[PDB]
Amino acid sequence: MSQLERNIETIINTFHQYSVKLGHPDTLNQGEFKELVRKDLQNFLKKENKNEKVIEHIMEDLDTNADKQLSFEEFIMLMARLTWASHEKMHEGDEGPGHHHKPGLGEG
Amino acid sequence: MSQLERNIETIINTFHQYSVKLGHPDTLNQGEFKELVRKDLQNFLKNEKVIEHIMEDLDTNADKQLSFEEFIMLMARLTWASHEKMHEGDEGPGHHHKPGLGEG
Amino acid sequence: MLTELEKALNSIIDVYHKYSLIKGNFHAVYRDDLKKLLETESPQYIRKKGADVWFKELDINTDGAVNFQEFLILVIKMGVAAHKKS
Amino acid sequence: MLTELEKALNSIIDVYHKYSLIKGNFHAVYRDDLKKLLETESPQYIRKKGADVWFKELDINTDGAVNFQEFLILVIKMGVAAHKKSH
Ligand SMILES: [Ca+2]
Ligand SMILES: [Ca+2]
Ligand SMILES: [Ca+2]
Ligand SMILES: [Ca+2]
Ligand SMILES: [Ca+2]
Ligand SMILES: [Ca+2]
Ligand SMILES: [Ca+2]
Ligand SMILES: [Ca+2]
Ligand SMILES: [Ca+2]
Ligand SMILES: [Mg+2]
Ligand SMILES: [Mg+2]
Ligand SMILES: [Zn+2]
Ligand SMILES: [Zn+2]
């Protein structure tokens, strides 16, 4: 299994660990999303986790079809956005020469 | 001409205002890029070494020039960055925009 | 005060919200919204691809909508196509 | 220390740079680099599309490479496809 495949599996397995708890087994309701963010994204969303209204807005923004659940398809955009945001932070104020990563999201 | 078409024409016309000056007329060299940044992105990009490295990052084929195709990814990135600032710390509920890049 | 270029980029945000604020998720352009967006904002050589074809191309996570990132894919593609035309 | 999920996301960054740091622009995966990436990192049902087809699909600005944001398009597409297969 490639590294990339392993990472995608981690995303899928994490999502489903929470999505099966309550209601529809393939979507996260607000309760399930908040728990995932609180624990599994405790460093990447450290500041956001301090304001429950920010977390709820994040879910509202990701809830593409507006049904108050996150499908895996909607959720994976959060994964892409946070991966993007971590990489952006590793390059904040980058002067070169060459390529170097500062600490990413939730670090430093 | 729609608003979106007009916005795209502004991007094309601005790029080519700088790219036609010197050397290849369809690409920007580093000095031309710096002048565009200094004057046309004076609000959205608010250190000289950092600007040089932004160009090296945008210079996809590594020929030290910015083509239009390479340049438009800066436009997309900065449009994204401005919207993100519009929603920084957003608590909602509902949709609202704080000022974007260079404002507020 | 924004430059001419910065005003164009800001306007791109506004164009997207003209359609994404019609209904539902505020950063979602649903299939019927994207038909309206393309018919209103895009030139014939872009529209001729078909709204449903564009929608499938742009909804990269197949969640039923074009969010703002997905819309910027369209802006990039329209920008490069306009440049190649001119 | 990062969570299991956060580590997977930072690993996606590392995977991309395994190929983007091969040559040229540090955030550019050229057409030949993408063939290597797909042959190494992606399952058969993804590779079968063809590396050339994927490249055309991912190089949205037709500048000759897949940058990090274009790569995330691939990651999103592979994740949704893997989800559909798994479930
Ligand atoms: Ca637990
Ligand atoms: Ca856990
Ligand atoms: Ca939903
Ligand atoms: Ca940057
Ligand atoms: Ca020139
Ligand atoms: Ca170049
Ligand atoms: Ca979508
Ligand atoms: Ca490279
Ligand atoms: Ca590209
Ligand atoms: Mg559930
Ligand atoms: Mg909407
Ligand atoms: Zn990097
Ligand atoms: Zn908005």
Author numbering:
A (entry chain C): 1 to 108
B (entry chain D): 1 to 46, 51 to 108
C (entry chain B): 1 to 86
D (entry chain A): 1 to 87
Mind quoting what the paper says about this structure?
CP sequesters zinc and other trace transition metals and serves as a key mediator of nutritional immunity (Brophy and Nolan 2015; Cho et al. 2015; Damo et al. 2013; Kehl‐Fie et al. 2011; Wakeman et al. 2016; Zygiel et al. 2021). CP contains one canonical tetrahedral His3Asp transition metal binding site formed by the side chains of His83 and His87 from S100A8 and His20 and Asp30 from S100A9. However, CP is unique in its ability to bind a wider range of transition metals with very high affinities, a consequence of its distinct octahedral binding site comprised of six histidine side chains: His17 and His27 from S100A8 and His91, His95, His103, and His105 from S100A9 (His6 site) (Damo et al. 2013; Nakashige et al. 2018).
To define how CP chelates Zn2+ ions, we set out to determine the X‐ray crystal structure of Ca2+‐loaded, Zn2+‐bound CP*. Crystallization of Zn2+‐bound CP* proved successful with sub‐stoichiometric levels of Zn2+ in solution, yielding crystals that diffracted to 1.87 Å. Refinement of the data produced the expected symmetric dimer of heterodimers with Ca2+ ions in the EF‐hands and Zn2+ ions bound in both His6 sites. The Zn2+ occupancy was 0.51 and 0.54 in the two His6 sites of the tetramer, reflecting the substoichiometric levels of Zn2+ in the buffer. As expected, the Zn2+ ions are coordinated by the Nε2 atoms of His17 and His27 of S100A8 and His91, His95, His103, and His105 of S100A9. The structure of CP* with a Zn2+ ion bound revealed hexacoordinate Zn2+ binding in the His6 site as is observed for Mn2+ and Ni2+. We attribute this observation to preferential crystallization of one species versus the other, that is, that the two half Zn2+‐loaded states are present in equilibrium in solution but that crystallization occurs much more readily for the species with a Zn2+ ion in the His6 site as opposed to the His3Asp site.
